[PDB]
């Protein structure tokens, strides 16, 4: 893993509306195949940088588990930021519709 700060900055630029107009202008004379190939090439460049530079270079976060810990941290951040938020919303929804635990209730007895 690497360039997390650059990724945050990319997300910021993406949400900035002015960049929406800039991208609208850049998309003049452009194809979906070209856009897809460019994105795929960017991702491949990132992963190739990793594969090459891990052989001789060590980041500030280097540890006896290597990039496994950084990847687990990315996963855990994604989890706590998105999935647990969705769980909170679903919990409030279920509590308003059926009551807390309503989705695990037993079938009506016959």
């Amino acid at each position: 893993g690497f360039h997390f700060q650059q990724y945050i900055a990319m997300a910021g630029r993406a949400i900035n509306p002015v960049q929406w107009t800039r991208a609208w202008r850049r998309m003049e004379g452009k194809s979906a195949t070209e856009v897809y190939r460019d994105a795929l090439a960017w991702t491949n460049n990132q992963f190739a940088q990793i594969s090459r530079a891990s052989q001789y270079r060590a980041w500030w976060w280097q540890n006896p588990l290597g990039m496994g810990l950084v990847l687990y941290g990315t996963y855990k951040a994604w989890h706590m930021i998105y999935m647990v938020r969705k769980q909170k919303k679903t919990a409030q929804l279920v509590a308003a519709a059926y009551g807390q635990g309503g989705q695990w209730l037993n079938p009506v007895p016959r």
Partner: protein
């Protein structure tokens, strides 16, 4: 063959067999007595009461 089935959930992470929530009218706490004071510890999110 006419009585209905109860939902099944089983995995390494969660299940629905360690407890019983009851029916829609006659409900019961799914956690047992020893861990009811520590219910917060068995949740990913917890929204407390208003008092």
């Amino acid at each position: 063959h006419e009585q209905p089935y109860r939902a099944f959930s089983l995995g390494f992470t969660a299940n629905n067999l360690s407890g019983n929530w009851g029916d829609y009218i006659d409900r019961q706490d799914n956690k047992n007595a020893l861990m009811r004071p520590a219910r917060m510890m068995f949740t990913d999110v917890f929204i407390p009461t208003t008092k």
